Amino acid sequence: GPKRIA
Amino acid sequence: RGSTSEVIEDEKQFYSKAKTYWKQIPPTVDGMLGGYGHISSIDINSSRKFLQRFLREGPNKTGTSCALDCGAGIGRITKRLLLPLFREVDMVDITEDFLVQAKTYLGEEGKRVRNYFCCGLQDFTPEPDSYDVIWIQWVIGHLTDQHLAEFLRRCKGSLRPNGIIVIKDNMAQEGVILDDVDSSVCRDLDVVRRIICSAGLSLLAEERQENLPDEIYHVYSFALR
Ligand SMILES: Nc1ncnc2c1ncn2[C@@H]1O[C@H](CSCC[C@H](N)C(=O)O)[C@@H](O)[C@H]1O
């Protein structure tokens, strides 16, 4: 799924 | 690093860690989307607009008889994108719990799901001359570079005339980034295009998803055949 930019 | 071969030290553990992760995720839309269920409708609406072009505008229009949902999970996309547009849909996913829940989640329209295949995409062979549209969303990061290319090649052999494959996924800023929690990779535009073009598929369309939250990786859709 959609993910926070690490 | 620019490939999975470099970021994936143990390919066997890259796959087993991901299977373990998904096996205990709740079979819900928030589980499918890592807490981003609030963008599901925005995502589906753009996917529909992206897909309706190949289905409405001739010549060589894409048919509407059957679609394959790859990495389908509980059927979020099958329910709101594919079933309203295709007579029948097949689903494939590695996680048994999601396929079982899909029967409940899809409701009455789920009776038009023909097969619930339980398989890793790296081991899955879609049947030749079966699908007008093969939809691959938020799952390509779970395959190695080589397995992705080979899977796309097998998908090509399963398309009906004028059929298309669609990939919709996160794109990294640069190179290949590994996510240690769910055991997946994120690749930049150049890496993905090279995997696709280099595997013998033609890139027909490419579109960045607009209106997404600021804090997440960019998302792109690709149409190929
Ligand atoms: N190797 C693999 N082969 C097939 N499915 C896999 C896989 N690795 C992870 N998955 C599946 O990939 C899905 C990612 S969540 C995405 C679900 C769906 N594409 C949607 O957008 O709503 C999960 O259902 C998980 O079970």
mmCIF file of C-alpha atoms and ligand atoms in Angstrom, chain A residues 1, chain B residues 15 18-19 22-23 29 31-33 43 69-77 92-95 98 119-122 135-139 142-143, ligand 1:
data_model
loop_
_atom_site.group_PDB
_atom_site.id
_atom_site.type_symbol
_atom_site.label_atom_id
_atom_site.label_comp_id
_atom_site.label_asym_id
_atom_site.label_seq_id
_atom_site.Cartn_x
_atom_site.Cartn_y
_atom_site.Cartn_z
ATOM 1 C CA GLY A 1 0.000 0.000 0.000
ATOM 2 C CA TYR B 15 9.833 -13.603 0.471
ATOM 3 C CA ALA B 18 6.687 -10.696 3.545
ATOM 4 C CA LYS B 19 4.452 -13.769 3.791
ATOM 5 C CA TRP B 22 0.737 -10.191 5.634
ATOM 6 C CA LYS B 23 -0.510 -13.324 7.442
ATOM 7 C CA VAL B 29 -9.219 -1.847 3.781
ATOM 8 C CA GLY B 31 -4.902 -3.298 6.406
ATOM 9 C CA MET B 32 -4.593 -3.269 2.616
ATOM 10 C CA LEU B 33 -3.580 0.397 2.633
ATOM 11 C CA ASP B 43 -7.177 6.039 -5.892
ATOM 12 C CA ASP B 69 -6.535 -8.689 -9.918
ATOM 13 C CA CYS B 70 -2.938 -9.414 -8.855
ATOM 14 C CA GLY B 71 -2.052 -9.096 -5.193
ATOM 15 C CA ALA B 72 -5.763 -8.490 -4.766
ATOM 16 C CA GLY B 73 -5.907 -8.805 -0.977
ATOM 17 C CA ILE B 74 -9.514 -8.672 0.223
ATOM 18 C CA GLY B 75 -10.670 -7.299 -3.128
ATOM 19 C CA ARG B 76 -10.662 -3.533 -2.540
ATOM 20 C CA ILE B 77 -9.903 -2.979 -6.235
ATOM 21 C CA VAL B 92 -4.673 -13.946 -6.963
ATOM 22 C CA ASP B 93 -2.988 -13.337 -3.614
ATOM 23 C CA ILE B 94 -0.485 -15.061 -1.359
ATOM 24 C CA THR B 95 -2.467 -14.539 1.875
ATOM 25 C CA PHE B 98 -7.513 -12.212 2.545
ATOM 26 C CA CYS B 119 -0.265 -18.148 -5.000
ATOM 27 C CA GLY B 120 2.772 -15.940 -4.904
ATOM 28 C CA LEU B 121 3.056 -13.998 -8.140
ATOM 29 C CA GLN B 122 6.606 -15.335 -8.499
ATOM 30 C CA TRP B 135 -4.287 -5.206 -12.731
ATOM 31 C CA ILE B 136 -1.159 -5.212 -10.549
ATOM 32 C CA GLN B 137 -1.364 -2.674 -7.724
ATOM 33 C CA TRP B 138 0.801 -2.156 -4.635
ATOM 34 C CA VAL B 139 2.520 -5.533 -4.974
ATOM 35 C CA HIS B 142 7.226 -7.845 -3.215
ATOM 36 C CA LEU B 143 9.002 -9.440 -6.206
HETATM 37 N N1 LIG C 1 4.623 -12.524 -3.477
HETATM 38 C C1 LIG C 1 3.335 -12.182 -3.453
HETATM 39 N N2 LIG C 1 2.481 -12.753 -4.372
HETATM 40 C C2 LIG C 1 1.137 -12.441 -4.383
HETATM 41 N N3 LIG C 1 0.644 -11.531 -3.468
HETATM 42 C C3 LIG C 1 1.477 -10.963 -2.557
HETATM 43 C C4 LIG C 1 2.832 -11.272 -2.526
HETATM 44 N N4 LIG C 1 3.393 -10.555 -1.526
HETATM 45 C C5 LIG C 1 2.435 -9.804 -0.925
HETATM 46 N N5 LIG C 1 1.241 -10.062 -1.554
HETATM 47 C C6 LIG C 1 -0.075 -9.469 -1.291
HETATM 48 O O1 LIG C 1 0.011 -8.131 -1.733
HETATM 49 C C7 LIG C 1 -1.030 -7.372 -1.144
HETATM 50 C C8 LIG C 1 -0.497 -5.979 -0.818
HETATM 51 S S1 LIG C 1 -1.719 -4.844 -0.093
HETATM 52 C C9 LIG C 1 -2.407 -4.437 -1.716
HETATM 53 C C10 LIG C 1 -3.776 -5.074 -1.934
HETATM 54 C C11 LIG C 1 -4.473 -4.583 -3.197
HETATM 55 N N6 LIG C 1 -3.550 -4.634 -4.336
HETATM 56 C C12 LIG C 1 -5.042 -3.185 -2.983
HETATM 57 O O2 LIG C 1 -4.522 -2.234 -3.560
HETATM 58 O O3 LIG C 1 -6.013 -2.983 -2.250
HETATM 59 C C13 LIG C 1 -1.479 -8.174 0.071
HETATM 60 O O4 LIG C 1 -2.780 -8.675 -0.167
HETATM 61 C C14 LIG C 1 -0.502 -9.340 0.160
HETATM 62 O O5 LIG C 1 -1.087 -10.547 0.608
#
